[PDB]
């Protein structure tokens, strides 16, 4: 019933603060639950269905 | 006479305007950087932390 | 120095130093997924397209 | 379709002597470490498994070669080598050099074996970068089996 993650292509919004310090270590050891880690070729808009 | 034929390009470049940090010590102005903003953001270890 | 001592005087000297360049190489890596690559050239139909 | 060229960065300038050893073998086969374009010198030669100080076997070295990719030299520039790359199927041009000579023909049959005749013939030394490079020797497979025949 809890809101889970999804990879639907959204019209993203450009923020201003960096979110780059202390990251690739952090999601490897659970800074926050329910992450998703993509590597390389999968940085694309997924297939959409309905 | 040798001066213009020594810096053959470096007399005629348009002069730009840069922001950085300075200090006067003795008489020699020392610029101070810290290359970590380009090196913290990727988790490649910084080569100044030997 | 020109100097009058018991020592025999010295010589004019000359030095020539050999210096040269150093090569360097830089990479970069792009992946483009083949599910993406072609549909730049797709069949071009629907308003979802 | 593809580009197959493995440049090698080199941390020190070469000598005048160690150009001439590499100049003597402009076309050869050395198994480098990993598939790349750019590569450190400590992964080019076979010398990662066959050093000076440690006693090598003659089994693991041959056994080590099936994992590595294989390459052919093109140039020697004094701060950078330049090696072309072998696919699992590709029509290249090889030009053999190797000093205990054996004449070839068309329709011949080759194996890439560890250097089992003279290491000083093979292992050209690099006093600059402190890492020796071992060259293995291609052999016709009439003798490509026959060396292991004597070995066992």
Automatic annotation (TrEMBL), chain B:
Query: Domain of life here?
Result: Viruses
Q: From which residue to which does the signal peptide run?
A: none
Q: What is this protein called?
A: ORF25
Automatic annotation (TrEMBL), chain D:
Molecular-function GO terms, alphabetical: structural molecule activity
Give the top-rank taxon of the lineage listed in the UniProt record for this protein.
Answer: Viruses
Q: Which UniProt keywords apply?
A: Capsid protein, Host nucleus, Virion
> What Gene Ontology cellular component terms go with this record?
viral capsid
Q: Where are the transmembrane segments?
A: none
Q: Provide the protein name.
A: ORF26
Annotated source species: Human herpesvirus 8
Q: Coding gene?
A: ORF26
């Amino acid at each position: 019933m809890e809101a889970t993650l999804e990879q639907r292509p959204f019209p993203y919004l450009a923020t201003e603060a960096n979110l780059l310090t202390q990251i690739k270590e952090s999601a490897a050891d659970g800074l926050f639950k329910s992450f998703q880690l993509l590597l390389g070729k999968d940085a694309r808009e997924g297939s959409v269905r309905f | 006479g040798d001066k213009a034929a020594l810096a053959d390009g470096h007399d005629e470049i348009q002069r730009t305007r840069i922001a950085a940090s300075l200090v006067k010590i003795g008489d020699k102005f020392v610029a101070i950087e810290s290359l970590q903003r380009m090196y913290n953001e990727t988790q490649f270890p910084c080569p100044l932390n030997r | 120095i020109a100097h009058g001592d018991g020592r025999r005087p010295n010589k004019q000297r000359q030095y020539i130093v050999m210096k040269a360049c150093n090569k360097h190489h830089i990479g970069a890596e792009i992946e483009l997924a083949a599910a993406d690559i072609e549909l730049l050239f797709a069949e071009k139909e629907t308003p979802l397209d | 379709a593809l580009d197959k060229s493995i440049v090698v960065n080199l941390t020190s300038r070469l000598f005048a002597d160690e150009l001439a050893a590499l100049q003597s073998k402009i076309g050869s086969v050395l198994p480098l470490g990993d598939c790349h374009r750019l590569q450190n010198i400590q992964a080019l030669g076979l010398g990662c498994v066959c050093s000076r100080e440690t006693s090598p076997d003659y089994i693991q070295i041959m056994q080590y070669l099936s994992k590595c990719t294989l390459a052919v030299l093109e140039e020697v520039r004094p701060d950078s080598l330049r090696l072309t790359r072998m696919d699992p199927s590709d029509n290249l041009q090889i030009k053999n050099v190797y000093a205990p000579f054996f004449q070839w023909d068309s329709n011949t049959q080759l194996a890439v074996l560890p250097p089992l005749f003279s290491r000083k013939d093979s292992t050209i030394v690099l006093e600059s970068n402190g890492f020796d490079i071992v060259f293995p020797m291609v052999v016709p497979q009439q003798l490509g089996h026959a060396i292991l025949q004597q070995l066992l």
